[PDB]
Design a protein around this motif. Structure first.
Motif, PDB file in Angstrom:
ATOM      1  N   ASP A 106       0.847  -1.181   0.000  1.00  0.00           N
ATOM      2  CA  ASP A 106       0.000   0.000   0.000  1.00  0.00           C
ATOM      3  C   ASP A 106       0.887   1.236   0.000  1.00  0.00           C
ATOM      4  O   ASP A 106       2.077   1.168   0.310  1.00  0.00           O
TER       5      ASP A 106
ATOM      6  N   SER B 124      -8.347   1.285   4.136  1.00  0.00           N
ATOM      7  CA  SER B 124      -7.589   0.956   2.938  1.00  0.00           C
ATOM      8  C   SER B 124      -8.480   0.663   1.741  1.00  0.00           C
ATOM      9  O   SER B 124      -7.996   0.711   0.605  1.00  0.00           O
TER      10      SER B 124
ATOM     11  N   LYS C 264     -11.376   2.958  -3.528  1.00  0.00           N
ATOM     12  CA  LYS C 264     -11.473   2.286  -4.815  1.00  0.00           C
ATOM     13  C   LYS C 264     -12.923   2.265  -5.287  1.00  0.00           C
ATOM     14  O   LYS C 264     -13.821   2.822  -4.651  1.00  0.00           O
TER      15      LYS C 264
ATOM     16  N   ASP D  33      -5.033  -5.358  -2.024  1.00  0.00           N
ATOM     17  CA  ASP D  33      -4.573  -4.237  -1.211  1.00  0.00           C
ATOM     18  C   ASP D  33      -4.978  -4.417   0.247  1.00  0.00           C
ATOM     19  O   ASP D  33      -4.175  -4.198   1.162  1.00  0.00           O
TER      20      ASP D  33
HETATM   21 MG   LIG Z   1      -4.482   2.420  -0.741  1.00  0.00          MG
END
Ligand SMILES: [Mg+2]
Ligand SMILES: Nc1ncnc2c1ncn2[C@@H]1O[C@H](COP(=O)(O)OP(=O)(O)O)[C@@H](O)[C@H]1O
Ligand SMILES: Nc1ncnc2c1ncn2[C@@H]1O[C@H](COP(=O)(O)OP(=O)(O)O)[C@@H](O)[C@H]1O
Ligand SMILES: Nc1ncnc2c1ncn2[C@@H]1O[C@H](COP(=O)(O)OP(=O)(O)O)[C@@H](O)[C@H]1O
Ligand SMILES: [Mg+2]
Ligand SMILES: [Mg+2]
Ligand SMILES: [Mg+2]
Lengths: 201, 526, 487, 479, 50
Positions: D44, D110, D114, D347
């Motif tokens: 990451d 995280s 997206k 990820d």
């Molecule tokens: Mg990221």
């Protein structure tokens, strides 16, 4: 060399041919040798390209392996026991044969050109043999001395001393390829004229 | 040129003046290209290839640059060959030799301009080199009878070698690794016994030297993954279709049951061989060839870890590490020696699993793990570590050292000048030119640093003339200091090779007065 | 490129390879020309090199000078056949004069000093002159070791010249043994043996195989197991056969198997693999052994004795080589050349070849003359003296030959940096005043013109060959009067 | 990105974007290597590292024009890097692996950047469960991500992604008729069920008409014997590995196996045998003599399912010997979506792996960068010389990330950064940019956190790459 | 054509090397060849006489 270094040998002389390992371990001068001229190939090879071997047991396999060496050594011993000291062939002479001959102080040469071999036979007095099963004395050539010498960067084999010779060889020196070619052309003109004059005078 | 033509179309000829001009220009260009990478404060070059799919590298070594540079001038090829041979011989000093040759030719150009025959210059240079090598030999300091002093000298040599490279950011860290790795060989000069494994990720300060050994291989399925008190058998045999009976045999029968029986005997042979292998009393088997799945399952059932496809280098390194021997035919368990180690396991580095041997018996070989942020960085790090390992091995083989930082060059220059002031004729000018060429390397070092090179060289020359045969450049401040106090040390063989190779190349190039080129072979476009 | 002060040429190949050389024959061979006369000069140089081996540039210089001198006579209205005849007469007179002033010295293993001096003189013109004393000693020692004396010839296949880049030129040496680029097959074999008994073989360490087409039929499990046993029995049997004769080292022309390699390691007997035929015959000649084709024929009378067999390792590369040394009286030696540059190695090889050829010429014929142009000056004086008694219009050709025979002192003086006409005028005046044909050009400026005192020596056959070959080539060139060629 | 061939990718991953471009400048061919190194080390932050490296290299220009030397710049950058490592390690916070809420927060942080941020409430627990099913929290020091297998299957939507605690195979069964078995005994084969064949050249010679029938009879009996031997152990499911030299399963053998009611699966790859054995507990067999009832594995269900139109899929579930493996089935209505979702799940897995490797946590939203800039600005004043300028430049080259975040969020970067710095300079060091609130606020209240290893690795690698770049002063072209 | 040179004083050789394609001129080459084959000397004199 110079032109005055040209020479005529009553006998025969020809260029060194290809040689295998061991050729340097055998003598290079003989006084009263006997010469064998052959048209036989002396090396370990298949008997015929038409052949095929079918076998069942490892003992027969081993016997088959030994048979080829036995055949080659039989030919070599047949050549050796005749008394010949120089061996010449039109066909390849193997490394095994070369080492065999070198271990007994004898000289061997292979892939000798046909014209050179015929001239050697005419000079010495033998006959080309395709079989080593009847190597008598009358088929062996004789010369009064045999040598190998250095000439201008090359190695040459000389057979000289035969009185019954019906041939001879020219060794021509010079400074260039065309120089030697023109020398040969000039020699031919005299040779033909002398032949005609011998015919009618 | 004569009205008659004595050459094919495309053939070329260059006579005295043009030939000398071309050779001098090429040599000086080659020297000037690589001058910039000299000294503790040299910089790097980027090499990118037009033909080889745009390969990129960043480097500082001189031989690496000169090999990749595509020169076409005939004179430059001699210098490139000299640098490559120097690298192949001692592995350090590939820039100094070519700089010295270029400076010598640059001096010879003006000497020719002063109407002096080249043979006079050659004789003068011969005498100058004869004096300089004697002075350098008389300047050497020999240790080795004292272990502490020998280790100190090795550390100084490594630290001096790594100064000009990127590893200068972590000089102590890499100096310790180099010294220990070299001393792990117990006096053998086997440089390929040290395996460098480089992988992306982590900072350059995370590189280390493994206390055991590391393989990047795998083990068979349904086999133990770690062993304590291992007994290792190292073999080089064929355990695949093992029945390569090199005879030209065949099978002819009149039934399918007979073929089935022969197929069963085939597996029986391999089972007997595996039992013979296991009869040695082992728990680890390492083969350089492939091990098929049936012997794999036999070993798994027996409870043995088997390593397959560890090539010649890996097998030899494992033998040197553990102490066993490379065995075959497995018919005399009392005449084969097994390896030994206290632990075999698997480790995770980055995203890779590696077989790890700990508690080894001999330690005659080692592996070095390099971590970095870029492939170019890893390549340069390995390329730099190679020089340190090579020079350490050489100085272990011959343990006499000479001080560096310009001191050796000034000593040789002083000897040459003292010789020159004693002789008549035009050769004195040649020897003074030789001394001038020798006194240029400290000048380039200081110039690359950014100091008053002329003043510093004047001070150094005065000190050497008055009798301070250990004075040199102090780069961390830019002054004159004592090399023995500061620990700047070098090997004697490297300096001797540099001097002799430079002199030989200079003479060879200088004896040329005519260049003849044949028509080039035309490339076929289509 | 003539004389001890001459310079050298750099030749670039068709592929971009570089050769720095002083040898006239190699330069003319590497040049590519269209002119048929130029090709004729190249062939003249090559013929001189093949015959004698030294003086390949003096001959072309002399031929050029002679052809240049013929031009004035051509312009004055003289038939070129007359010029050729006059050249022949002058060449015969000069050759007859040449052997009258020659001195014979010696050929033996005891003194070797004149041979060393001759080799020094022949090596004085090359880049090797830094260690020319050492290399002359090496050359004379090698030729005296290899030479056959009753027949008065040497074989250059018994001298092996090898060079590896690296180290110093002074590291060049002579080995009365063999050096090959191989190593021991198994990495754990000992690297030295001090009382080696060598068994030289030409058969692979593999079970036998007939040459003719064959098929072995396996029809049963019993036959399968019999074959399986036979395979390993052969491997054991060959090793016991080799060991039973007392040999300590084995050399083979072909490869081994893994089983044979491990058995050889286990039975404490190192071996060498994949060697060549010439190397095998050289090893046999050096160690006194014999080459055997089978293991069945191996006997203790066919082994060779070697006082040391070692493996030598060079610098940071992995390259290793094998050396066989300290044999009894040997007919084979090797020259190990070292240097810092590939072209250095090549030029060292060429210079050593020149020295060996000169020493061979001394073996063939052992009477010499003195160099530095003294022989040329004396021959020119003799031709000029003889020409005064020839009235039949050939005196012009004879004097042209005499003038063209004096180009060597011009070349030497001009290369050395002095004045040609004054120098040779003074030298010729001294020669005619005194009676010393041994006066020449002081190239190295030692303060004397006496080449006999300065130890400058040349073979007689070299000068004879130069004169005769140049004269005949000039005659051929003069005879031509027409040329046809395409566009 | 559209390639030269014609393939199309849609992505947010920095390393993927940089690899898919074709940058030509040599200085731009090291940033992709830096991104790959960060991807390997942490998985990451592949974008922030490149942003930081670019910012530092940009800041170097003013110093170079002013007259500082590159060596001095490099040394000062190293000093600032050491101070920054100290500050970040001070700012970190301990964490325990038994706290599921922290792992959920880290995974969703995280994952919320997206295309699958809308499905985070379904994808975060899958990732946490997948990581927790493979390691032993008592002593786990690293995570092998090759123990988790991702299978991409077109059709449906992302909502249909699922976790399988068993074995999933993409190939079909060769047995016509049998598709579901309960209480399955499974065996794995590494030999061929076909006519006998020796490794030497074998051939059968016939010279009488009886042998013609005898050969067929013997071959039939030979096959039948192997089939009966396999049936003797009670095996229900058979797996055969790939073979390319001889036929591994003949029609006669398949007919006999079907008559004995055994489901056959063929062409198992040679490189997933280890995974299959690890998952279901089987043991490879390479000789029929070793086919014994103790070499089989036991499973509760082994059956093939047919998706709506995409195809078949073999599932084996309920293993008596559960290994430390798991698999994930990823769905989607388009290939671009499927690959992007796969990258997002990777990820998340990498972030959890980093959190296992280092038990430390830190606040996100630009807090570490703004705190680093403030602390280094304070640190610079204590120094004297060019060092002060270089350290202050290094400090100022760290506002770029908060400025970029504010600019992307659509706020005023100058005001946002000024407020952030002022708030960090009078107390709380967890304040950050709030995109939901649209301002500056405490960032832990929004439950956005990240591992410390990501920031440390990014800073270290960026500084090392910059120091390497400052060393170069010439470009040459070779062959 | 191939660049190979020939230096000769022999009339028959010179005439062969020349590439004569004139039908009337070919007779003088033919008689020279005939003389060379028959007696071996006198190749120029016959051409000059004709
Ligand atoms: Mg990221
Ligand atoms: N720390 C140092 N202080 C002074 N001189 C040094 C130092 N390190 C190396 N040198 C000098 O640098 C030169 C070596 O050049 P360098 O680029 O390091 O090696 P190479 O010979 O491979 O080019 C030598 O003259 C050596 O004395
Ligand atoms: N020390 C010397 N003093 C005087 N003349 C020498 C000396 N060494 C060589 N020469 C002369 O130089 C001439 C040329 O020899 P060299 O240049 O070696 O080429 P080559 O021998 O092929 O002609 C010889 O004729 C020789 O007489
Ligand atoms: N909800 C959020 N609010 C504010 N900042 C966030 C939020 N989620 C993530 N961030 C921050 O945005 C950055 C994440 O950007 P990202 O696209 O993941 O880059 P990378 O792939 O380089 O990590 C980090 O600074 C992270 O802390
Ligand atoms: Mg160095
Ligand atoms: Mg000479
Ligand atoms: Mg006539």
């Amino acid at each position: 060399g110079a032109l005055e270094d040209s020479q005529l040998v009553a006998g025969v002389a020809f260029k060194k041919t290809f040689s295998y390992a061991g050729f340097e371990m055998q003598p290079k001068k003989y006084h009263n040798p006997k010469i064998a001229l052959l048209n036989v190939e002396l090396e370990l090879k298949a008997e015929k390209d038409n052949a095929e071997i079918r076998v069942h047991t490892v003992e027969d396999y081993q016997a088959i392996v030994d048979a080829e060496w036995n055949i080659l050594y039989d030919k070599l011993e047949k050549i050796h026991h005749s008394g010949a000291k120089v061996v010449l062939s039109k066909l390849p002479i193997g490394d095994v044969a070369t080492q065999y001959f070198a271990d007994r102080d004898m000289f061997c040469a292979g892939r000798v050109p046909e014209e050179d071999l015929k001239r050697t036979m005419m000079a010495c007095g033998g006959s080309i043999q395709t079989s080593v099963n009847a190597l008598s004395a009358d088929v062996l050539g004789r010369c009064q001395v045999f040598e190998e010498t250095q000439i201008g960067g090359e190695r040459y084999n000389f057979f000289t001393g035969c009185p019954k010779a019906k041939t001879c060889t020219f060794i021509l020196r010079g400074g260039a390829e065309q120089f030697m070619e023109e020398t040969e052309r000039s020699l031919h003109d005299a040779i033909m004229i002398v032949r005609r004059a011998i015919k009618n005078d | 040129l004569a009205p008659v033509n004595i050459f094919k179309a495309g053939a070329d000829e260059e006579r005295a003046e043009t030939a000398r001009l071309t050779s001098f220009i090429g040599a000086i260009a080659i020297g000037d290209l690589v001058k910039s990478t000299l000294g503790p404060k040299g910089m790097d070059k980027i090499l990118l290839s037009s033909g080889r799919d745009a390969s990129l590298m960043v480097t500082n070594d001189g031989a690496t640059i000169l090999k990749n540079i595509g020169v076409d001038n005939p004179a430059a090829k001699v210098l490139v060959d000299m640098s490559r041979v120097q690298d192949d011989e001692v592995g350090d000093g590939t820039t100094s030799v070519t700089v010295l040759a270029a400076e010598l030719l640059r001096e010879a150009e003006s000497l020719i301009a002063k109407k002096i025959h080249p043979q006079t210059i050659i004789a003068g240079w011969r005498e100058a080199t004869k004096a300089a090598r004697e002075a350098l030999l008389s300047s050497a300091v020999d240790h080795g009878s004292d272990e502490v002093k020998f280790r100190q000298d090795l550390m100084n040599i490594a630290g001096t070698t790594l100064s000009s490279k990127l590893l200068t950011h972590h000089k102590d860290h890499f100096t310790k690794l180099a010294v220990e790795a070299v001393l792990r060989l117990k006096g053998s000069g086997n440089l390929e016994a040290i395996h460098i494994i480089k992988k992306l990720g982590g900072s350059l300060a995370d590189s280390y030297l493994d206390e055991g050994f590391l393989l990047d291989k795998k083990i068979g399925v349904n086999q133990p993954k770690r062993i304590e008190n291992a007994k290792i058998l190292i073999a080089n045999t064929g355990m695949d279709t093992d029945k390569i009976k090199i005879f030209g045999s065949r099978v002819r029968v009149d039934s399918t049951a007979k073929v089935a029986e022969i197929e069963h005997a085939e597996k029986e042979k391999m089972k007997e061989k595996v039992e013979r292998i296991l009869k040695h009393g082992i728990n680890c088997f390492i083969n350089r060839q492939l091990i098929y799945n049936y012997p794999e399952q036999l070993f798994g059932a027996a409870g043995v870890m088997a390593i397959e496809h560890a090539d010649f280098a890996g097998v030899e390194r494992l033998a040197l590490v553990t102490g066993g021997e490379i065995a075959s035919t497995f018919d005399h368990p009392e005449l084969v020696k097994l390896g030994s180690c206290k632990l075999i396991e698997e480790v995770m580095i980055g995203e890779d699993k590696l077989i790890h041997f700990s508690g080894v018996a001999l330690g005659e070989a080692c592996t070095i793990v390099l971590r970095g942020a870029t492939q170019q960085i890893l390549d340069e790090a390995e390329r730099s570590l190679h020089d340190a390992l090579c020079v350490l091995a050489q100085t272990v083989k011959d343990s006499r050292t000479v001080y560096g930082g310009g001191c050796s060059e000034m000593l040789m220059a002083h000897a040459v000048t003292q010789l020159a002031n004693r002789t008549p004729g035009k050769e004195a000018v040649a020897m003074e030119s030789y001394a001038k060429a020798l006194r240029m390397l400290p000048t380039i070092i200081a110039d690359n640093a950014g100091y008053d090179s002329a003043d510093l060289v004047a001070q150094l020359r005065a000190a050497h003339s008055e009798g301070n045969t250990t004075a040199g450049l102090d780069m961390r401040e830019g002054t004159i200091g004592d090399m023995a106090i500061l620990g700047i040390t070098e090997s004697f063989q490297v300096k001797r090779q540099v001097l002799l190779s430079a002199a030989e190349a200079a003479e060879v190039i200088l004896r040329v007065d005519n260049i003849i080129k044949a028509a080039p072979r035309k490339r076929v476009p289509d | 490129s003539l004389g001890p002060n001459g310079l050298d040429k750099m030749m670039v190949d068709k592929d971009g390879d570089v050769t720095v050389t002083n040898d006239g024959a190699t330069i003319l061979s590497m040049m590519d020309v269209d002119h048929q006369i130029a090709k004729l000069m190249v062939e003249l140089s090559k013929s001189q090199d093949d015959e004698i081996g030294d003086g390949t540039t003096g001959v072309v210089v002399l031929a050029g000078a002679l052809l240049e001198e013929a031009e004035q006579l051509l312009d004055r209205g003289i038939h070129p056949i007359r010029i050729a005849d006059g050249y022949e007469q002058a060449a015969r007179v000069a050759i007859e004069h040449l052997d009258k002033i020659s001195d014979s010295v010696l050929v033996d293993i005891k003194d070797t000093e004149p041979l060393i001096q001759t080799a020094k003189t022949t090596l004085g013109s090359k880049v090797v002159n830094s260690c020319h004393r050492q290399m002359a000693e090496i050359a004379v020692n090698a030729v005296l070791t290899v030479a056959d004396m009753e027949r008065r010839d040497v074989d250059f296949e018994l001298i092996k010249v090898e060079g590896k880049v690296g180290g110093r030129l002074e590291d060049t040496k002579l080995i009365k043994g063999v050096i090959v680029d191989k190593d021991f097959s198994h990495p754990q074999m000992p690297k030295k043996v001090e009382d080696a008994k060598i068994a030289i073989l030409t058969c692979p360490f593999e079970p036998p195989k007939p040459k003719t087409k064959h098929k072995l039929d396996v029809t049963s499990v019993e036959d399968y197991k019999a074959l399986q046993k036979y395979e390993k029995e052969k491997f054991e049997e060959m090793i016991q056969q080799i060991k039973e004769t007392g040999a300590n080292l084995a050399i083979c022309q072909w490869g081994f198997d893994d089983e044979a390699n491990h058995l050889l390691l286990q039975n404490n007997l190192p071996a060498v693999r994949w060697v060549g035929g010439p190397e095998i015959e050289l090893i046999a000649i050096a160690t006194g052994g014999r080459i055997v084709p089978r293991f069945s024929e191996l006997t203790a009378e066919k082994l060779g004795f070697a006082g040391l067999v070692q493996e030598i390792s060079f610098g940071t590369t992995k390259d290793k080589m094998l050396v066989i040394e300290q044999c009894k009286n040997s007919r084979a030696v090797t020259i190990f050349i070292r240097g810092g540059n590939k072209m250095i190695i090549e030029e060292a090889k060429r210079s050593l070849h020149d020295a060996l050829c000169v020493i061979r010429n001394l073996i063939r014929d052992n009477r010499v003359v003195y160099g530095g142009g003294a022989a040329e000056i004396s021959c020119a004086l003799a031709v000029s003296q003889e020409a005064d008694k020839c009235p039949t219009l050939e005196q012009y050709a004879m004097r042209a030959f005499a003038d063209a025979l004096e180009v060597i002192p011009m070349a030497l003086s001009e290369n050395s940096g002095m004045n040609p006409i004054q120098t040779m005028t003074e030298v010729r005046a001294r020669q005619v005043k005194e009676m010393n044909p041994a006066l020449g050009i002081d190239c190295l400026h030692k303060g004397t013109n006496d080449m006999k005192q300065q130890h400058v020596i040349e073979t007689l056959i070299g000068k004879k060959q130069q004169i005769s070959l140049a004269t005949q080539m000039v005659r051929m060139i003069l005879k031509i009067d027409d040329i046809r060629k395409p566009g | 990105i559209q390639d030269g061939k014609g393939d199309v990718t849609i992505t947010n991953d920095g390393a993927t974007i940089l690899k898919q471009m074709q940058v030509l400048h040599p200085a731009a061919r090291m940033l992709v290597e830096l991104s790959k190194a960060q991807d390997i080390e942490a998985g990451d932050g592949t974008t922030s590292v490149v942003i930081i490296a670019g910012s530092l290299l940009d800041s170097c220009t003013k110093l170079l024009q002013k007259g500082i030397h590159p060596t001095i710049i490099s040394e000062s950058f190293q000093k600032a890097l050491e101070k920054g490592i100290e500050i970040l390690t001070d700012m970190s916070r301990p964490v325990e692996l038994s706290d599921r809420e922290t792992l959920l927060n880290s995974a969703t942080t995280s994952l919320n950047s997206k295309v699958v941020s809308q499905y985070s409430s379904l994808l975060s627990p899958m990732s946490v469960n997948a990581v927790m099913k493979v390691i032993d929290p008592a002593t786990a020091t690293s995570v092998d991500l090759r123990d988790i297998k991702i299978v991409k299957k077109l059709g449906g939507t992302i909502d249909d992604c699922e976790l399988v605690e068993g074995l999933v195979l993409t190939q079909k069964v060769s047995n016509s008729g049998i598709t579901r078995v309960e209480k399955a005994k499974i065996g794995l084969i590494q030999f061929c069920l076909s006519a006998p064949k020796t490794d030497m050249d074998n051939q059968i010679v016939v010279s009488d008409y009886a042998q013609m029938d005898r050969v067929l009879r013997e071959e039939r009996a030979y096959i039948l014997n192997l089939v009966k031997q396999i049936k003797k152990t009670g095996c229900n499911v058979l797996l055969i590995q790939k073979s390319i030299l001889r036929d591994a399963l003949s029609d006669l053998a398949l007919h006999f196996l079907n008559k004995m009611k055994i489901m056959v699966i063929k062409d198992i790859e040679r490189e997933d045998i280890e995974f299959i054995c690890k998952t279901i507990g089987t043991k490879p067999v390479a000789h029929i003599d070793q086919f014994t009832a103790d070499m089989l594995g036991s499973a509760e269900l082994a059956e093939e399912v047919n998706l709506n139109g995409s195809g078949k899929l073999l599932k084996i579930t309920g293993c008596a010997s559960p290994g430390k493996t798991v698999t994930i089935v990823v769905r989607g209505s388009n290939k671009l979506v499927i690959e992007e979702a796969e990258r997002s799940i990777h990820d998340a897995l990498c972030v959890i792996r980093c959190l296992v490797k280092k038990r430390a946590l830190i606040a996100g939203g630009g807090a570490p960068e703004i705190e680093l800039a403030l602390r280094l600005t304070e640190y610079s004043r204590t120094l004297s010389g060019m060092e002060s300028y270089c350290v202050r430049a290094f400090a100022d080259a760290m506002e770029v990330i908060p400025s970029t975040l504010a600019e992307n969020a659509g706020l005023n970067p100058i005001s946002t950064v000024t407020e952030l710095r002022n708030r960090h300079a009078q107390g709380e060091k967890t304040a950050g940019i709030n995109v939901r609130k649209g301002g500056i606020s405490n960032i832990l209240e929004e439950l956005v956190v990240q591992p410390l290893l990501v920031s440390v690795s990014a800073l270290t690698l960026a500084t090392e790459t910059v120091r390497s770049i400052l060393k170069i002063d010439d470009v040459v072209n070779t062959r | 054509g191939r660049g190979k040179a020939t230096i000769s004083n022999d009339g028959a050789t010179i005439l062969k090397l020349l590439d004569v394609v004139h039908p009337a001129a070919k007779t003088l080459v033919d008689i020279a060849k005939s003389q060379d084959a028959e007696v071996g000397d006198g190749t120029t004199s016959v051409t000059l006489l004709a």
